[PDB]
């Protein structure tokens with residue numbers, strides 16, 4: 221589909237069964253998600269945003285549907301404003317910037 | 320021009336006679352660069368996100384040169400960790416996500 225940034229590129233995502241509205245973000249490298257429970261074990265990850273580094277959990281190889289395109293991968297979880305799908309999951313669904 | 324997301328979407332920009340590198344960020348409400356002197360008056364503002372907030376100066380009606388395309392509109396100045404081009408200026412050069 222073609223999305224125009226006049227608004228926040230917010231889309232529905234399916235992770236673990238529940239639907240969640242996330243933010244498509246070319247700025248972020250990874251996909252950070254809001255506090256939630258997910259399968260398996262997690263590793264520790266430091267990520268520094270516009271306001272500093274925080275500790276987030278990391279579950280690799282996680283199946284998430286993004287706007288209708290099943291993708292499986294690293295999903296960082298921690299204290300984030302909104303859900304954020306980063307390039308790791310953007311390259312999967314085949315996302316691109318065009319102007 | 321199709322910009323892939325295998326790496327960070329960094330493109331050269333020109334502002335205030337200067338030349339700086341900046342991350343195309345659809346996940347960025349507005350454009351915000353690192354400390355630099357901008358013309359005009361300004362109103363202070365704060366911005367949240369991963370890590371919290373940061374105080375920034377908000378200069379409006381500012382001309383910018385992205386990839387050659389000329390865009391106009393607000394620009395934030397502050398301790399951001401990297402040069403960010405937001406949706407407010409992206410919409411101008413006509414940028415979009417595709418998959």
Ligand SMILES: Cc1nc(CN2CCN([C@H](C(=O)N[C@@H](Cc3ccccc3)[C@H](O)CN(CC(C)C)S(=O)(=O)c3ccc(/C=N/O)cc3)C(C)C)C2=O)cs1
Pocket residue numbers: 243245246247248249250252267268269270301302304342344346347348349350351366367368369400401403405
């Ligand atoms: C060190 C470095 N490390 C990286 C990679 N990194 C480091 C961290 N990171 C992601 C990340 O936080 N990306 C940021 C951009 C950014 C890029 C590089 C450094 C810092 C921030 C988002 O795309 C935009 N944010 C909104 C979002 C949080 C809702 S904003 O900046 O807070 C924001 C901007 C403008 C306004 C304006 N209002 O009006 C409001 C909020 C994390 C989630 C993983 C990333 O890709 C690059 S350099």
